[PDB]
Amino acid sequence: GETKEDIARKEQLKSLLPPLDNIINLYDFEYLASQTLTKQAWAYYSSGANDEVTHRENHNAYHRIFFKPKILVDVRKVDISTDMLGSHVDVPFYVSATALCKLGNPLEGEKDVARGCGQGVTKVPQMISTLASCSPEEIIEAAPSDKQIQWYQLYVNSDRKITDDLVKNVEKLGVKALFVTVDAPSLGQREKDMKLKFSNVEESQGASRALSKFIDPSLTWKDIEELKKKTKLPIVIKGVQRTEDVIKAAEIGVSGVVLSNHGGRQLDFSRAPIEVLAETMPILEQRNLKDKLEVFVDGGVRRGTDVLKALCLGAKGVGLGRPFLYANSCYGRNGVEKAIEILRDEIEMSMRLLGVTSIAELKPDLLDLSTLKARTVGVPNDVLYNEVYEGPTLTEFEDA
Amino acid sequence: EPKLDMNKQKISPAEVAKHNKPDDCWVVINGYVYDLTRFLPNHPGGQDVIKFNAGKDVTAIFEPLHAPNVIDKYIAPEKKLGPLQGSMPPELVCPPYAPGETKEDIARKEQLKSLLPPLDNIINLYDFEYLASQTLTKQAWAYYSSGANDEVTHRENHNAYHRIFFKPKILVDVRKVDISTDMLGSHVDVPFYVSATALCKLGNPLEGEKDVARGCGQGVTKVPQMISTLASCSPEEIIEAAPSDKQIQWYQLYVNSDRKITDDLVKNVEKLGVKALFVTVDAPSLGQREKDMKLKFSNGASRALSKFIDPSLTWKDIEELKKKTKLPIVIKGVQRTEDVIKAAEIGVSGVVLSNHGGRQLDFSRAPIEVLAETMPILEQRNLKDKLEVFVDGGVRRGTDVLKALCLGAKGVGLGRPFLYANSCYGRNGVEKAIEILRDEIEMSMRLLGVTSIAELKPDLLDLSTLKARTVGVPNDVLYNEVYEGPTLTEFEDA
Amino acid sequence: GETKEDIARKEQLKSLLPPLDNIINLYDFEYLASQTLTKQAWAYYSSGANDEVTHRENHNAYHRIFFKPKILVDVRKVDISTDMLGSHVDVPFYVSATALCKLGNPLEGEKDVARGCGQGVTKVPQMISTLASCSPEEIIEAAPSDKQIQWYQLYVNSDRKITDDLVKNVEKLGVKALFVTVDAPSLGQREKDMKLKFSNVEESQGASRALSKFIDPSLTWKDIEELKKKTKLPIVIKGVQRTEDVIKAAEIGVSGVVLSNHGGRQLDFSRAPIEVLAETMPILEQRNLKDKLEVFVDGGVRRGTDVLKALCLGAKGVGLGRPFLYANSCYGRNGVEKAIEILRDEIEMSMRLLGVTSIAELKPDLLDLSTLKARTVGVPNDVLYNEVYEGPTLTEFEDA
Amino acid sequence: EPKLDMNKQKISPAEVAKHNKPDDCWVVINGYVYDLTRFLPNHPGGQDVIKFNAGKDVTAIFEPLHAPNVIDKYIAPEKKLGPLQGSMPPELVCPPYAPGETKEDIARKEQLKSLLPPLDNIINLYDFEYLASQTLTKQAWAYYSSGANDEVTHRENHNAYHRIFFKPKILVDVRKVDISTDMLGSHVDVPFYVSATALCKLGNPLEGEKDVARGCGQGVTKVPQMISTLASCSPEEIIEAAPSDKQIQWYQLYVNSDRKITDDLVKNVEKLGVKALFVTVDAPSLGQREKDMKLKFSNGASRALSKFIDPSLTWKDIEELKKKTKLPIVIKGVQRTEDVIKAAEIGVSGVVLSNHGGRQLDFSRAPIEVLAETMPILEQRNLKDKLEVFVDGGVRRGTDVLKALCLGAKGVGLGRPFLYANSCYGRNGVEKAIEILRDEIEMSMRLLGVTSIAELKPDLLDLSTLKARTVGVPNDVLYNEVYEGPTLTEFEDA
Ligand code: HEM
Ligand code: HEM
Ligand SMILES: Cc1cc2nc3c(=O)[nH]c(=O)nc-3n(C[C@H](O)[C@H](O)[C@H](O)COP(=O)(O)O)c2cc1C
Ligand SMILES: Cc1cc2nc3c(=O)[nH]c(=O)nc-3n(C[C@H](O)[C@H](O)[C@H](O)COP(=O)(O)O)c2cc1C
Ligand SMILES: Cc1cc2nc3c(=O)[nH]c(=O)nc-3n(C[C@H](O)[C@H](O)[C@H](O)COP(=O)(O)O)c2cc1C
Ligand SMILES: Cc1cc2nc3c(=O)[nH]c(=O)nc-3n(C[C@H](O)[C@H](O)[C@H](O)COP(=O)(O)O)c2cc1C
C-alpha cells in the first residue's frame, strides 16, 4: 504494500470501472479486480498453493473435453433449473464459500453477495464460510428474498463445543445444509501472500505454523458420523479428491460430496475435479450408489460450457469461488447478479447449440472424452535450434 | 429500401423524431418512414444498431450493408408509415457504420492506396488475410475474423489438419494430374467451393457477392459459389452477375419461423437456376463473437434468437422440404456421426460436417476428425455411396483439401479466405485465390504420386496422431524463469 | 535484395567470423551463415516447402527418443568406422548432395567440400549433386586424398541420352555409386525464395511451372530396372517416404534406399525419416530383407546423438545437407573438416556414455521409443485465461 | 601446494619462464616449481587453463579452487623441480579466475552487499537459485548451472515430476506426522540428502564444503552429506568441520586408473568415519557443458578422458571392491532397469538412479521414470528389500520427494539447490534449505493424509501421464501470426 497506491487504485476505480453492460465474460471481472484491489486483496484471493499447477489445471482440464452436439432438435425453449439437496434451483451453479469477502467489499462483505444472489430474477444458492467477514446472522438476514437458499460451510473446531453451538446457531437461522470442508486440515502455502507479506514472532510453530485450532487437523470419518446424529441438515463433505472417499461418503450415508481441491490453494498436484468426476461417476453407477449421493464439483469454472461439461458427466451442481469474489469487489451486489446473468445465459445459449432442453438431458454422450487424459508435458524444446530458425513471412505492403 | 410509397401519408421530422425508443422505434431509410418496433427483436444483425439509432435517417448505415430486396420482403405493408416531409434536423441523420473507427479511414485508405502489392506477388491465402487485417475497417475485421467465445473451435479446425501426415508414393508417372470431380450431379473443375458468408459488402461495398460470382466463373477454372440467405445482394443480382453458363450456384437456406416466406424463397431459387439447397442447421441460436461485441460497447439468451432462423427446425421439416422441391438437399452444420446416419436414413443427398467456421458452439470438434470417424462407419452400413460428405473450417492449404479428399469427403468449402481476397482485390482476388489453391493441390498430388481425385485414399495418410489433441500441465513458471538456455556463437565485430 | 548490403555482410564477415576453435556445435555455423550469406544464399539454402512443418519435424522427431545407456562397460576405446556400399568408412555419416554450393562459396563451390572431406584425418563420403555448381570432373579431381569416396547423385533427364552420357562420364571418373533422387518429380515451393524473389514471363507454365525437363516427372520403377542393366555402380533410391517403397526397392534389387524427404523442401507433411526408419526396420527383418538392402536416412541431423539414434534403429549411415553447406560458406574446406571433427567427437563421446565400443553394437535396446509417436498438437490455449493470470515470483533483492 | 621443498634445487624466473608450452609446461604454485607437462592431459579441470598459463605464478588461480591435499597426492616427487629464486617478472603472475568477468565484481559484490534479503525472507529453493544467478561470477554460474549439450535431460529431470499427480486421502487424523527414515543402516531425520558436488569453493571460497558440513549438522534436523572425490576441501577437513557426532557422511568415489591411489583413498575414508561408498559410474567420459566452454573461448573425444576417472571400470571391479571394504557400496549413475538388477545380482547395497544432474549424456531419461518402471520389476523378482534405491535430478519441492518416496525410493538427493544456498549464505543458507524442504514434506504429507514415510505407497499417485513426454508438430507460424486473440475489458480512465 500500500504505497499510498490508493490514489491510483481509487482513480483506477473511479467511475473508471466501465458500466456493468460492458461486461462480457467472468474474465472481465478478474482483469478488473486485478487492477483495482489492494495488493493484499489480490494476493489472498487470486493465489493457489506453491507453483499453482492444480489451480491452473482445474481450468485446462475443461479445455480437453469437446462436445458432440445434436442438430435438428426443436430448441425454442430451454429449462436450466434443477434440485440440489431437496430444494429446487433456477440454475445448476452456486456461489461457493470464500472467507474474507471484506478484503474486497469493505462495507458489505458477504451481505452484498446474498443480495446479488437474490435481488434479480435468477436466485442462486450462497455457501457461507465458517470464515466469513460478516456473521451468519447479518448474512442470512441480508438476503432480499425468501426463495433464495443459503448453505453453511463449516470448519470443525478443535474445541468441539464451539461447533455444537455453531451448528445450532445455523439450523435456527434457516441454512438448508452444511458443507463440511475436509481439504484444509493444514493450510496450503500461497507464496504470493507470503511474498508481499515479507514487507519489512508468534512464539513457536514450524510446519506446525500452518496448523490451526479452528481446523481440527484431527477430523475423521467417525466425527462425521457423530455429526449426523446432532442435526437435521443434510451433510455434504467438501474436498474429496479421489474416488475411494466418495465411496466412503456413501458407505456412511452423508447426502453429498463436493469434488474440490480448494480452488488450487491446498495440495498442489491434486487433479482437476472434472477428471475425478469422470473417473468416479461410472464406479458409483456400477455399485448402485448414484441415486444415493449428490456429487458437486468446483475449481476453474469460467464459462457455461464448463458448467455443461460437469453436468453431462453426472454432477448435480457446480460451484464458483473467484469469479464471484471479483464481481463482488469491483461492483458489489450488482456485480454479482450480473456475473449470474452472464453465466445463466451461456448455459442456455450453449444448451440450444447442443440440442437439449433440460438439465436431465445432459448426458455423457454429448461429450468427447478421447483426450481428457491427455495431460502431458513435452520434452524441453531445443534452444539453439529454435533460435537460429526463422519461419515463413507475410507480404509486406508497399511503396509510398 | 425501395419505397412502395403508397402515395401519400405525409410525415415530419418531429412526428418521427418523437418515436426514438423501443416500445415503438421509427426510422427514416431514404425518403420514407417505417415503424421498426415489432421488427427489431428479429433483425438478423442485432437489436442494438437499430434501437440506438431511433428515429433518425439510418440511410447511411443501411443502404451500403443490405441486399436491395429486404424491405419489400420482410417488412409488413403496415410498417411503411409515410414519405418524410423534406428532410430531418441534420445531426439526426446517421453517418456510415464503423464502430471504433477513430477518423482512421486515412491510414487504411492510404494503406490500400496502391500500397497493396500487385496481385502477382500473392503467394498464399494467409497473404490475403494479413492484407485484409491492415485495411478492413476494425469492424469488418472483427465480423469476418472472429469465432464464438474463447475461439478454441475456430483454431482447432485448422490445427487438426496439422496432426495428419502423408505416406507418399515415389516412382509413379506424374506427368499428367487431374483434379476435376463431381459434386451433387455436376462436373466441377476442382474439389473445393466458396461457402456461404453474409455481409460481403462490408469489405467490398461496390459489389459484395456479385464479385465472388465473377471471380468464380470468369477464368479457366470455375468454382461452385454457395449463396447465403443473409447475403448483402439479392440472389437474382448474384446469379445475373455470373459470367459462364458453366459455373454452378448453390443456395444456402435458413428456414424462417414463417414457413410461407421459405416456401416462397425456395420456389424463387429453383427458378433462378441454383443447383442445390444447403440447409444450415448449426445456428438455431446466434454464436457469441466477443471481439465484435466489445467493439460496439467500446468504440438475454433469447436476444440470440430471431424468427429469421427458426429455433424449431426438426428432421421432420427436412423430410417435408424434399416433397416440395427437386433440388438435391444438403444438411449444413452436422457435427457428429449419429446425425450423418440420420441424414442417410431420411434420404437427403449430402451433409456438410461443419461448426460454422467456429462461430457457433465453442468445444465443437474439427470437421476433419468427425470425417475420420464417420466414413469407416458409413462403409460398414454400406451408406457410403448414398450420401456426399463435404467439410469446411480452417482449410488454408492445398494439402488440407487433399487430407479431406483422402478421408472420403467429396469436396471442401472455404469461407474466410475468399472474404479477404474479395475485400482486398475484388473479383481478381477471388480468381487469384482459386489459382493459388488449384496449383497447391496439383503440386501436392504429383508429390504424393497420385494422378486423379479417384486415387486419393486413406492409405496415403498417417492418422496415428489425429486424436493427439492435448493440454499440457500448467508448467512451472517459477523454475523456467530462473533458467538460461545455451547460446550460439556471437561474432567479434558485431 | 542486395541493397549494397555487402558493405555490412562483408564487414560482418571480416575476420569477424570468430576463429574455427571457437566453434562448438553444427548450430554455430548456421547462426554464422544466417548473418553473412546474401539474402538469396540464405533463402535458397535454409527454406523448406510451404509452412516448413516437415523440415522442423525432421529435427524434433529425434527429440522424442531417449536412451537406455549401459554403465560399468570398459569404454576406454571406441571405433565408429563402418562399411557403406562395399566401401569402408571412418565414420557412419556423409555429406549429402546440395545443388548450388557456389551461392555460398563463390570461388570453390563443391571443390572446397571435397577438400574438407579428405584433407584431415577423418575422410567422409561426398554425394555429388547432378545440380552442382562445379563439374563432376573438377570435383572428383579436387579430392586431396585417394582413400576418400565420392558418390554421384543423379537427376534423370526427360532426354535419356543425356543420363546415358552422364552415367558413363561418372563411372569413368571413379564415383563409387549412384544415388537416384525420386522425391522431386515436381519442385517444392519454398516461399522464402519466391518472397525475396518478388523483388520488383517464361512464356507459359502453371503448376506446370514447377515441372522441369531435367527431372523426368515420368520416372518409374521400370526405369530403375533399365538403369541397373546399363551400369556396375550399386544403385540407391533417394527419397523413400514410406515402408511399401522400401520393400519395392528390395523386390527389384537396388543396393540401398535413402529415407529422405529432401530436407523438408518437397512435400510438406511428409513424416520425419527417423520415424519411417523405425516403422520400417522390423518389417524388413520379418521378411528377410535386412541383409539385402542398406537403408540410409537424412533430415534434421545436428548432433552425434541424432546419428546414434538412426544407427540403433538400423541405418547404415546417415546424411547431413545444411550444416555442411553452412560450414562450407563461412569458412570453406576448413569449415567443413571442422564440422566433421565436431560430429565425429560427439559420436565417440556419446558412445562411451552409452556403453558400447563399435557401430555393430548400436541396437534398438539402447533406445526408449515409448513416445516417438507422441507427435501432438494441443487445443488452442485460452487467451483470456492466460492473460489475466500471473504466476509465482522470485525474491527481488534489496535496499540501496 | 604445500611444498615438500626437497631442500635445494634453486630455480629462476627465466629458467621457468622458458618452459611455457605443452611438450613440457612448468608452473609456479606458491614459491615452488613443478613440471605439469605429463599431468595436464589428466587435470580434472581441463588441459587448457594450465596449458595456456604456461610458466607463470598460477598461484592465484589454483590456491582458492583446490583441496589442500592435491600436490602431495597426485604429483610425482620428480615433478617438484625447485623453490623459485625470489619472484617472477610481475605480469607473468596470474590473476584470479573469472573468465568473462569484465571488471564486474563491483555490481555483484554490491549486489550481495547486503542487497541480499534476510534469510527469513526465503520462501523456496528457486529463491536461492535466482539470488545465486545474480551474484555468482559468470563462470561459477555456468559451472554450477549447466547440463550436457542441449540440456534436455537436465530440464526433463524436473519436468517428469510435473506429470505425476496425487490422489490424497481426506478425513484421516493428521495431527502428528513423522518424516524420519533409515538409509543404509542409519536413522536419518529426513528422506533427502545433499549429493556430491565438486568445486564448492567457486561460490563459497572461504569454506566450500566445510560450510555444507555445518549447515547439515548444526540444527535440529541433520542431513546426510555426500562428499565428492573431486571436492575443493580435503575429506579430513570436511569431516572435522562437522558439528554433531549424529550427522552422517558418505563418500562419493571416482576410481582412478592407478588402483593403488583408490585403494589408498578407500582405506583413509573408512578411518575418517564415512558410512557408505557411492561409486559414480556415469562419467567415464566428461559431459560437454557448452555454456561453460563458450565462456572460456569467449571471455579430441580423448581430451574428455582422464586417468582420474577410469574409463575402464567394470562390474568385476565392483565385485573386487566389496572384498576390500566393510562400508556398504552404492552404484551412482544407474540409468536403466537392467543395471539395477545386475547391481542386485553382484550383491551391492543400493544404487542411485541418476544421469548426474543432466551433465553427462543428453537423452538420458528422468530418474523418476526409471524408478517407476524399475520397482514393480524388482518386486516380481523379490529383489525389492535387498537393494536400497535412491534417485536424484531436478528435485526442487517437497512434493517431488514424496513422489519419489511413493514409488519406492529410500531417499532423494539434491545437488544444485545446496550449491546455491551455500554460495549466497554459507552454512545458514544450507540449514535454511533443509528447513524449507523438511517443512514442505511435512505440510504435503498432512494434505495427502499419511503420517509416516512407511505409508507413502503408489496408490497415492496418479501415473497415467508419466510417459506423456511429447513433442508438438512444428506448428504454423504463418497462420498463428496473422491471428488475434479475444481481449478483456479495458477501463475508461486507464
Ligand atoms: C427489414 C429490414 C432489415 C433487414 C431484413 C435486415 C437484415 C440484415 C441482415 C441479413 C444482416 C446481416 C446478418 C448476418 O451477419 O448474419 C444485417 C446486418 C446489419 N443491419 Fe440490417 N436489416 C434490416 C434493417 C436494418 C436497419 C433499419 C438498420 C439501421 C441501423 C440496419 C443496420 C444493420 C447493421 C449496422 C448491420 C451489421 C451489424 C454488424 O454485424 O455489426 N439494418 N441486417
Ligand atoms: C595436481 C595438481 C592439480 C589437481 C589434482 C587438480 C584438480 C582439480 C579438480 C579436482 C578440479 C575440479 C573438477 C571438477 O569440476 O570435476 C580442478 C579444476 C580446476 N583447476 Fe585444478 N588441479 C591441479 C592443478 C591445477 C593447476 C596447476 C591449475 C592452474 C591453472 C589449475 C586450475 C584449475 C582451474 C582454473 C579449475 C576450474 C576450471 C573450470 O571448471 O573452469 N589446477 N582441478
Ligand atoms: C479467496 C478464497 C477463499 C476461500 N475460502 C474458503 C472457505 O472459507 N471455506 C471453504 O470451504 N472454501 C474456501 N475456498 C474454496 C472455495 O469454496 C472453492 O472450493 C474454490 O474457489 C473453487 O475454485 P474457483 O475459485 O476457481 O471457482 C476459498 C477460495 C478462495 C479463492
Ligand atoms: C463472416 C462469415 C459469415 C458467415 N455467414 C454464413 C451464412 O450466412 N450462412 C451459413 O450457412 N454459413 C455462414 N458462415 C459459415 C460458413 O459458410 C463456413 O461454414 C465457414 O466460413 C467455414 O470456415 P472458414 O471460414 O474457416 O473457411 C459464415 C462465416 C463467416 C466467416
Ligand atoms: C540447399 C539444398 C540443396 C539441395 N539439393 C539437392 C540436390 O541437388 N539433389 C538431392 O538429391 N538433394 C538435394 N538436397 C537434399 C539433400 O541431399 C538432403 O536430403 C537434405 O539436406 C537432408 O536434410 P538436412 O539438410 O537438414 O541435413 C538439397 C538440400 C538443400 C538444403
Ligand atoms: C556443479 C556440480 C558438480 C558435480 N560434481 C559431482 C561429483 O564430483 N561427483 C558426483 O558423483 N556427482 C557430481 N555431480 C552430480 C550430482 O551429485 C547430482 O547427481 C546432481 O547434482 C543431481 O541433480 P540436481 O543438481 O538437479 O539436484 C555434480 C553436480 C553439479 C551440479
JSON list of C-alpha atoms in Angstrom, two decimals, chain B residues 334-435:
[
{"chain": "B", "resi": 334, "resn": "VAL", "atom": "CA", "xyz": [-23.58, -31.62, -38.98]},
{"chain": "B", "resi": 335, "resn": "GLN", "atom": "CA", "xyz": [-21.21, -32.34, -36.09]},
{"chain": "B", "resi": 336, "resn": "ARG", "atom": "CA", "xyz": [-21.38, -35.94, -35.11]},
{"chain": "B", "resi": 337, "resn": "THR", "atom": "CA", "xyz": [-21.72, -39.28, -36.82]},
{"chain": "B", "resi": 338, "resn": "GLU", "atom": "CA", "xyz": [-25.16, -40.06, -35.49]},
{"chain": "B", "resi": 339, "resn": "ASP", "atom": "CA", "xyz": [-26.63, -37.04, -37.43]},
{"chain": "B", "resi": 340, "resn": "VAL", "atom": "CA", "xyz": [-24.83, -38.16, -40.61]},
{"chain": "B", "resi": 341, "resn": "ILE", "atom": "CA", "xyz": [-26.55, -41.58, -40.36]},
{"chain": "B", "resi": 342, "resn": "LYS", "atom": "CA", "xyz": [-29.84, -39.94, -39.69]},
{"chain": "B", "resi": 343, "resn": "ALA", "atom": "CA", "xyz": [-29.31, -37.77, -42.82]},
{"chain": "B", "resi": 344, "resn": "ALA", "atom": "CA", "xyz": [-28.74, -41.02, -44.72]},
{"chain": "B", "resi": 345, "resn": "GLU", "atom": "CA", "xyz": [-31.95, -42.52, -43.20]},
{"chain": "B", "resi": 346, "resn": "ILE", "atom": "CA", "xyz": [-34.23, -39.63, -44.32]},
{"chain": "B", "resi": 347, "resn": "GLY", "atom": "CA", "xyz": [-32.67, -39.85, -47.83]},
{"chain": "B", "resi": 348, "resn": "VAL", "atom": "CA", "xyz": [-31.14, -36.31, -48.32]},
{"chain": "B", "resi": 349, "resn": "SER", "atom": "CA", "xyz": [-28.26, -36.00, -50.80]},
{"chain": "B", "resi": 350, "resn": "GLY", "atom": "CA", "xyz": [-25.35, -34.97, -48.53]},
{"chain": "B", "resi": 351, "resn": "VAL", "atom": "CA", "xyz": [-24.24, -33.04, -45.47]},
{"chain": "B", "resi": 352, "resn": "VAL", "atom": "CA", "xyz": [-21.61, -30.52, -44.56]},
{"chain": "B", "resi": 353, "resn": "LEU", "atom": "CA", "xyz": [-19.62, -31.59, -41.42]},
{"chain": "B", "resi": 354, "resn": "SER", "atom": "CA", "xyz": [-19.14, -28.01, -40.17]},
{"chain": "B", "resi": 355, "resn": "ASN", "atom": "CA", "xyz": [-19.36, -25.98, -36.93]},
{"chain": "B", "resi": 356, "resn": "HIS", "atom": "CA", "xyz": [-19.74, -22.76, -38.96]},
{"chain": "B", "resi": 357, "resn": "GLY", "atom": "CA", "xyz": [-16.05, -21.52, -39.13]},
{"chain": "B", "resi": 358, "resn": "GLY", "atom": "CA", "xyz": [-16.06, -21.85, -35.36]},
{"chain": "B", "resi": 359, "resn": "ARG", "atom": "CA", "xyz": [-18.57, -19.07, -34.94]},
{"chain": "B", "resi": 360, "resn": "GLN", "atom": "CA", "xyz": [-21.36, -21.04, -33.12]},
{"chain": "B", "resi": 361, "resn": "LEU", "atom": "CA", "xyz": [-20.65, -23.68, -30.36]},
{"chain": "B", "resi": 362, "resn": "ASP", "atom": "CA", "xyz": [-17.10, -23.43, -28.89]},
{"chain": "B", "resi": 363, "resn": "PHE", "atom": "CA", "xyz": [-15.85, -27.08, -27.99]},
{"chain": "B", "resi": 364, "resn": "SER", "atom": "CA", "xyz": [-17.34, -28.33, -31.19]},
{"chain": "B", "resi": 365, "resn": "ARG", "atom": "CA", "xyz": [-14.70, -30.68, -32.85]},
{"chain": "B", "resi": 366, "resn": "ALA", "atom": "CA", "xyz": [-12.74, -30.17, -36.07]},
{"chain": "B", "resi": 367, "resn": "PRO", "atom": "CA", "xyz": [-14.88, -31.43, -39.03]},
{"chain": "B", "resi": 368, "resn": "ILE", "atom": "CA", "xyz": [-11.69, -33.37, -40.32]},
{"chain": "B", "resi": 369, "resn": "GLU", "atom": "CA", "xyz": [-11.79, -35.55, -37.23]},
{"chain": "B", "resi": 370, "resn": "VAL", "atom": "CA", "xyz": [-15.59, -36.05, -37.43]},
{"chain": "B", "resi": 371, "resn": "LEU", "atom": "CA", "xyz": [-14.89, -37.02, -41.07]},
{"chain": "B", "resi": 372, "resn": "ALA", "atom": "CA", "xyz": [-12.25, -39.62, -39.99]},
{"chain": "B", "resi": 373, "resn": "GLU", "atom": "CA", "xyz": [-14.57, -41.47, -37.66]},
{"chain": "B", "resi": 374, "resn": "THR", "atom": "CA", "xyz": [-17.67, -41.10, -39.83]},
{"chain": "B", "resi": 375, "resn": "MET", "atom": "CA", "xyz": [-16.56, -42.55, -43.25]},
{"chain": "B", "resi": 376, "resn": "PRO", "atom": "CA", "xyz": [-15.47, -46.00, -41.87]},
{"chain": "B", "resi": 377, "resn": "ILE", "atom": "CA", "xyz": [-18.81, -46.14, -40.04]},
{"chain": "B", "resi": 378, "resn": "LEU", "atom": "CA", "xyz": [-20.66, -45.19, -43.33]},
{"chain": "B", "resi": 379, "resn": "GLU", "atom": "CA", "xyz": [-18.82, -48.06, -45.18]},
{"chain": "B", "resi": 380, "resn": "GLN", "atom": "CA", "xyz": [-19.92, -50.60, -42.56]},
{"chain": "B", "resi": 381, "resn": "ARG", "atom": "CA", "xyz": [-23.58, -49.82, -43.29]},
{"chain": "B", "resi": 382, "resn": "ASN", "atom": "CA", "xyz": [-22.96, -49.53, -46.98]},
{"chain": "B", "resi": 383, "resn": "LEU", "atom": "CA", "xyz": [-24.22, -45.92, -46.76]},
{"chain": "B", "resi": 384, "resn": "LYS", "atom": "CA", "xyz": [-21.06, -44.56, -48.23]},
{"chain": "B", "resi": 385, "resn": "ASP", "atom": "CA", "xyz": [-22.17, -44.13, -51.87]},
{"chain": "B", "resi": 386, "resn": "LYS", "atom": "CA", "xyz": [-25.62, -42.90, -50.90]},
{"chain": "B", "resi": 387, "resn": "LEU", "atom": "CA", "xyz": [-24.65, -39.56, -49.31]},
{"chain": "B", "resi": 388, "resn": "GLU", "atom": "CA", "xyz": [-21.98, -36.99, -50.44]},
{"chain": "B", "resi": 389, "resn": "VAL", "atom": "CA", "xyz": [-19.90, -35.67, -47.42]},
{"chain": "B", "resi": 390, "resn": "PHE", "atom": "CA", "xyz": [-18.47, -32.13, -47.67]},
{"chain": "B", "resi": 391, "resn": "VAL", "atom": "CA", "xyz": [-16.42, -30.49, -44.89]},
{"chain": "B", "resi": 392, "resn": "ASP", "atom": "CA", "xyz": [-15.40, -26.86, -44.12]},
{"chain": "B", "resi": 393, "resn": "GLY", "atom": "CA", "xyz": [-13.45, -24.93, -41.36]},
{"chain": "B", "resi": 394, "resn": "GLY", "atom": "CA", "xyz": [-9.83, -23.86, -41.30]},
{"chain": "B", "resi": 395, "resn": "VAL", "atom": "CA", "xyz": [-8.79, -25.04, -44.86]},
{"chain": "B", "resi": 396, "resn": "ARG", "atom": "CA", "xyz": [-5.92, -22.87, -45.96]},
{"chain": "B", "resi": 397, "resn": "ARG", "atom": "CA", "xyz": [-3.59, -25.02, -48.00]},
{"chain": "B", "resi": 398, "resn": "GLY", "atom": "CA", "xyz": [-3.84, -27.47, -50.82]},
{"chain": "B", "resi": 399, "resn": "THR", "atom": "CA", "xyz": [-2.57, -30.24, -48.51]},
{"chain": "B", "resi": 400, "resn": "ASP", "atom": "CA", "xyz": [-5.60, -29.58, -46.24]},
{"chain": "B", "resi": 401, "resn": "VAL", "atom": "CA", "xyz": [-8.04, -30.38, -49.16]},
{"chain": "B", "resi": 402, "resn": "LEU", "atom": "CA", "xyz": [-6.10, -33.47, -50.04]},
{"chain": "B", "resi": 403, "resn": "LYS", "atom": "CA", "xyz": [-6.29, -34.67, -46.44]},
{"chain": "B", "resi": 404, "resn": "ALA", "atom": "CA", "xyz": [-10.09, -34.24, -46.56]},
{"chain": "B", "resi": 405, "resn": "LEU", "atom": "CA", "xyz": [-10.37, -35.94, -50.02]},
{"chain": "B", "resi": 406, "resn": "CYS", "atom": "CA", "xyz": [-8.21, -38.96, -48.87]},
{"chain": "B", "resi": 407, "resn": "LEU", "atom": "CA", "xyz": [-10.65, -39.40, -45.89]},
{"chain": "B", "resi": 408, "resn": "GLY", "atom": "CA", "xyz": [-13.66, -39.65, -48.23]},
{"chain": "B", "resi": 409, "resn": "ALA", "atom": "CA", "xyz": [-15.06, -36.05, -48.41]},
{"chain": "B", "resi": 410, "resn": "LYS", "atom": "CA", "xyz": [-16.45, -35.18, -51.92]},
{"chain": "B", "resi": 411, "resn": "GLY", "atom": "CA", "xyz": [-15.38, -31.52, -51.72]},
{"chain": "B", "resi": 412, "resn": "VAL", "atom": "CA", "xyz": [-14.19, -28.94, -49.30]},
{"chain": "B", "resi": 413, "resn": "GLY", "atom": "CA", "xyz": [-15.51, -25.41, -48.59]},
{"chain": "B", "resi": 414, "resn": "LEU", "atom": "CA", "xyz": [-13.81, -22.18, -47.64]},
{"chain": "B", "resi": 415, "resn": "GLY", "atom": "CA", "xyz": [-15.42, -19.07, -46.24]},
{"chain": "B", "resi": 416, "resn": "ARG", "atom": "CA", "xyz": [-12.78, -16.55, -44.79]},
{"chain": "B", "resi": 417, "resn": "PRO", "atom": "CA", "xyz": [-10.05, -16.65, -47.46]},
{"chain": "B", "resi": 418, "resn": "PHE", "atom": "CA", "xyz": [-12.44, -15.64, -50.27]},
{"chain": "B", "resi": 419, "resn": "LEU", "atom": "CA", "xyz": [-13.91, -12.81, -47.99]},
{"chain": "B", "resi": 420, "resn": "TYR", "atom": "CA", "xyz": [-10.43, -11.46, -47.61]},
{"chain": "B", "resi": 421, "resn": "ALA", "atom": "CA", "xyz": [-9.37, -11.98, -51.28]},
{"chain": "B", "resi": 422, "resn": "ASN", "atom": "CA", "xyz": [-12.69, -10.28, -52.30]},
{"chain": "B", "resi": 423, "resn": "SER", "atom": "CA", "xyz": [-12.26, -7.38, -49.80]},
{"chain": "B", "resi": 424, "resn": "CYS", "atom": "CA", "xyz": [-8.67, -6.52, -50.89]},
{"chain": "B", "resi": 425, "resn": "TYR", "atom": "CA", "xyz": [-8.84, -7.08, -54.65]},
{"chain": "B", "resi": 426, "resn": "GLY", "atom": "CA", "xyz": [-12.46, -7.89, -55.60]},
{"chain": "B", "resi": 427, "resn": "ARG", "atom": "CA", "xyz": [-13.07, -10.34, -58.46]},
{"chain": "B", "resi": 428, "resn": "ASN", "atom": "CA", "xyz": [-9.40, -10.82, -59.44]},
{"chain": "B", "resi": 429, "resn": "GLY", "atom": "CA", "xyz": [-8.52, -11.57, -55.69]},
{"chain": "B", "resi": 430, "resn": "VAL", "atom": "CA", "xyz": [-11.21, -14.32, -55.86]},
{"chain": "B", "resi": 431, "resn": "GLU", "atom": "CA", "xyz": [-9.77, -15.62, -59.16]},
{"chain": "B", "resi": 432, "resn": "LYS", "atom": "CA", "xyz": [-6.23, -15.43, -57.72]},
{"chain": "B", "resi": 433, "resn": "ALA", "atom": "CA", "xyz": [-7.38, -17.34, -54.52]},
{"chain": "B", "resi": 434, "resn": "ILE", "atom": "CA", "xyz": [-8.80, -20.12, -56.79]},
{"chain": "B", "resi": 435, "resn": "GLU", "atom": "CA", "xyz": [-5.49, -20.30, -58.87]}
]
